[PDB]
């Protein structure tokens, strides 16, 4: 087409979605990761994770307001990945990289799994 | 912080949100612009438009599944702006620029109003 494009639009949208999450505006699901609860927008989770895409496109699961993750999932790893979904920034540290990579494999976040594998390879 | 950032994340999220819109997945509102209906995600509309942000943060309006816009709003102008919200690309043409600018002023999309004003100034 003959369109013009606003370079910062996608980043500005994501920043506003994170501001809505902060202010608990229109959050429509609670993700339970053992003893912790995380509120989020189903659409953002589906846009970032192959696991959430499969969950919320299922005719029965799309209607649930609470999703319980596998008990082996680490809440801190999930929290770091949820922040990445809403900001593009990944708080990857020597002390959390194994939990983050395991959580990203479970959530099917291929780009995160890729950077974790590379950082682990560099340490060996 | 000591975060790393995935450059293409925000653009990839927006592309996936547009794929959900295409496939009518988790759309939760219908915007009526005279005889036309447009399905969308309330969160994306709020992230892009000062008008939708004010509408869906209102305690009564946040619960509506149908929003009727002012009858003076042109459906084609709205359609072009809705596509911009989900893609960052604005289909601005000599034949639609006045309707697009008027719709962007009503929707409170300051960056779009700015580019329309500049393109109009260049023609004069």
């Amino acid at each position: 087409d003959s369109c013009i494009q606003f370079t910062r639009h996608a980043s500005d949208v994501l920043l506003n979605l994170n501001r809505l999450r902060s202010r608990d505006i229109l959050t429509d699901v609670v993700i339970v990761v053992s003893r912790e609860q995380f509120r989020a927008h189903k659409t953002v989770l589906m846009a970032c994770s192959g696991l959430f895409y499969s969950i919320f496109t299922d005719q029965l699961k799309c209607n649930l307001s609470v999703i319980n993750l596998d008990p082996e999932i680490n809440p801190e790893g999930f929290c770091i990945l949820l922040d990445f979904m809403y900001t593009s920034r990944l708080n990857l540290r020597e002390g959390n990289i194994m939990a983050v990579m395991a959580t990203a494999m479970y959530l099917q976040m291929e780009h995160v799994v890729d950077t974790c594998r590379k950082f682990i390879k560099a340490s060996e | 912080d000591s975060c790393i950032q995935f450059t293409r994340h925000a653009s990839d999220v927006l592309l996936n949100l547009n794929r959900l819109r295409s496939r009518d997945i988790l759309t939760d509102v219908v915007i009526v612009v005279s005889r036309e209906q447009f399905r969308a995600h309330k969160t994306v509309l709020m992230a892009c438009s000062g008008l939708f942000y004010s509408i869906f943060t209102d305690q009564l309006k946040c619960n509506l599944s149908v929003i009727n816009l002012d009858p003076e709003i042109n459906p084609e102008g709205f359609c072009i702006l809705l596509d911009f919200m989900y893609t960052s690309r604005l289909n601005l043409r000599e034949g639609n620029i006045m309707a697009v600018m008027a719709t962007a002023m009503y929707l409170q999309m300051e960056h779009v109003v700015d580019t329309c004003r500049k393109f109009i100034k260049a023609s004069e």
Binding site: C3, I4, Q5, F6 | -
Partner: peptide, 4 residues
């Protein structure tokens, strides 16, 4: 704004 740019030409994409």
């Amino acid at each position: 704004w740019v030409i994409p």
